[PDB]
Amino acid sequence: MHHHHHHKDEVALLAAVTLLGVLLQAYFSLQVISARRAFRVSPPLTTGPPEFERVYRAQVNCSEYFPLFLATLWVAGIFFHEGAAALCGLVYLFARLRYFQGYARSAQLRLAPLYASARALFLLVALAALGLLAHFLPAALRAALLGRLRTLLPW
Amino acid sequence: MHHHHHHKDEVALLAAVTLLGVLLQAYFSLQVISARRAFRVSPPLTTGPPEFERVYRAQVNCSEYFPLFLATLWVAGIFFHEGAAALCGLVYLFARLRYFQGYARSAQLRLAPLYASARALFLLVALAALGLLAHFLPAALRAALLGRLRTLLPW
Amino acid sequence: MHHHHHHKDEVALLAAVTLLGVLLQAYFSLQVISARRAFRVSPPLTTGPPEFERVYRAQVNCSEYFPLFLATLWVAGIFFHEGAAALCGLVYLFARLRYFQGYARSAQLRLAPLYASARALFLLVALAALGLLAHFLPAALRAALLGRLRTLLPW
Ligand SMILES: CCCCCCSC[C@H](NC(=O)CC[C@H]([NH3+])C(=O)O)C(=O)NCC(=O)O
Ligand SMILES: CCCCCCSC[C@H](NC(=O)CC[C@H]([NH3+])C(=O)O)C(=O)NCC(=O)O
Ligand SMILES: CCCCCCSC[C@H](NC(=O)CC[C@H]([NH3+])C(=O)O)C(=O)NCC(=O)O
Ligand SMILES: CCCCCC/C=C/CCCCCCCC(=O)O
Ligand SMILES: CCCCCC/C=C/CCCCCCCC(=O)O
Ligand SMILES: CCCCCC/C=C/CCCCCCCC(=O)O
Ligand code: NI
Ligand code: NI
Ligand code: NI
Ligand code: NI
Ligand code: NI
Ligand code: NI
Ligand code: NI
């Protein structure tokens, strides 16, 4: 409720990539509505020509991975480095744009941008994990050390 | 680990709408379990009478958009205005309640609450984007200006 | 942009459980790719032997609930108690590991870990709600009281 300082400046790159990510998903959503119109595939029903089913499955897959991306983007960028995480985030979303576009053309044209997208996601997870190790490990090691020394009143 | 100040008060409306959103999704989930019972549609399998397939597809669609909603709600409410974002959030979730209820009755009875829900989501994205522009633009413009003036030792 | 204090230490358990959650989902994703290979079920297409359809449906269900889990984990852990929320989070994810593994074997072998997972999710929602009540209620009650007393210049 104020507060005479804010933490916006530490997370704005993350928020910018996050917004970009949302805009990407809405774009994917518009394409599926477009494919539904082109091939007359009506709500409910998610089956039809393989083409339609590739665009629909493309959107579904991106949606499933979007929270995973968001989660690791925020943990990595808060526990490791904002800029690095934001950069991997960019690569991830661009790869995902390629994945969608390719899959719409062909199943096989989804594979390479999928591999790009997973490497970038893997990098975020690695950064996040390292960032959390740096946070918990020193206190843990010290507590272990502060337990075995005792010894005590000897040694 | 304390810290003698917290930022809860800046985000509590956002957290309240977020919790409301979760409760809505669980409600949707309970209805699908109810529709599965009524029409004997057993796990796995997501096909059956169109009615069941409308309630099931209703839940699926809300689930796909829920992270997008959450993301933009938090960016908008942190970079633009908490109260405004929380309000749009309310409208979004109410529209989504209508969408679900309507779609359960009819495909065509999902359309108007869908249009309401997308306008509200659009407003959050707009707020988020404006909020981020306000944050990055001034520093960017100044840096551009601080580059071309030089001139320098003339002018 | 610094800032000579950080709030990492208040949320690191939450971030740790969140990362664990992401790793779990990626694990689920790898199993579905494995089941696709075993039973030759090719992208797009999400139908096949019931076995494959149980592993696929297992992943889908976890994905749908993962943002709900994340949302309530963060609200609960910020508005109620970090450690408690992180603990419920652990139980939730372990239950979810069991759910996946069971469902892969049998539909009926998914039920008990599902009940565990929903109780844990229910606990997080309860904590979150209590935490938010504690935050809004006192200010609300006082404002109500500060309205009816007036009376004023009497009583
Ligand atoms: C760094 C961690 C990486 C995370 C796991 C990598 S596995 C790839 C991932 N596999 C899945 O999502 C499995 C389920 C998917 N929903 C499906 O039906 O095939 C995928 O892209 N599936 C769809 C596709 O292959 O296009
Ligand atoms: C402000 C940004 C708005 C975001 C994009 C708007 S498009 C509407 C949106 N379209 C989709 O989600 C496409 C995929 C959807 N899963 C489907 O199978 O039809 C929708 O509501 N689909 C289901 C439906 O029409 O009921
Ligand atoms: C504390 C709040 C709890 C939230 C609601 C509990 S209902 C259980 C939940 N039901 C659903 O998700 C409904 C939709 C689901 N996608 C489906 O097709 O069956 C579930 O686990 N469905 C799949 C399954 O039964 O395995
Ligand atoms: C995972 C999806 C998006 C996550 C966004 C949540 C990040 C919030 C952290 C920073 C905000 C701290 C308090 C608010 C400060 C302010 O109002 O300026
Ligand atoms: C996107 C889904 C929900 C996002 C929630 C994340 C928001 C967290 C920002 C504020 C918390 C700052 C540190 C904790 C302060 C405290 O413990 O009181
Ligand atoms: C819901 C998915 C994950 C949510 C993660 C968002 C939580 C952020 C809150 C704490 C961060 C506050 C500002 C950053 C401080 C820092 O850089 O050390
Ligand atoms: Ni003040
Ligand atoms: Ni202050
Ligand atoms: Ni102190
Ligand atoms: Ni302090
Ligand atoms: Ni300084
Ligand atoms: Ni400071
Ligand atoms: Ni602070």
Author numbering:
A (entry chain A), B (entry chain A), C (entry chain A): -5 to 149
Q: Could you pull the original sentences from the published paper?
A:
Leukotriene (LT) C4 synthase (LTC4S) catalyzes the conjugation of the fatty acid LTA4 with the tripeptide GSH to produce LTC4, the parent compound of the cysteinyl leukotrienes, important mediators of asthma. LTC4S is a trimeric integral membrane protein and a member of the MAPEG (membrane-associated proteins in eicosanoid and glutathione metabolism) family, which also includes three microsomal GSH S-transferases, 5-lipoxygenase activating protein, and microsomal prostaglandin E synthase 1 (9, 10). The crystal structure of human LTC4S has been solved and identified a unique horseshoe-shaped conformation of GSH bound at the active site by residues from two neighboring monomers. It was postulated that the lipid substrate LTA4 binds in a hydrophobic crevice between two monomers and that Trp-116 could act as a “molecular ruler” for binding of LTA4 with its ω-end buried under the aromatic side chain.
To further probe the role of Trp-116 for the positioning of LTA4 at the active site, we solved the structures of W116A and W116F LTC4S in complex with analog I, at 2.7 and 2.4 Å resolution, respectively. Considering the inherent variability that comes with enzyme assays with highly unstable lipid substrates, no major kinetic alterations were observed, thus demonstrating that Trp-116 is not essential for catalysis. The 3-fold increased LTA4 turnover of the W116F mutant may reflect a Phe configuration, which leaves the active site open to the lipid bilayer, thus facilitating product release (see below). To detail binding interactions and analog positions, we used the structures of LTC4S and the mutant W116F in complex with analog I because they have the best interpretable electron densities. This is most likely due to the larger space available in the absence of the tryptophan residue.
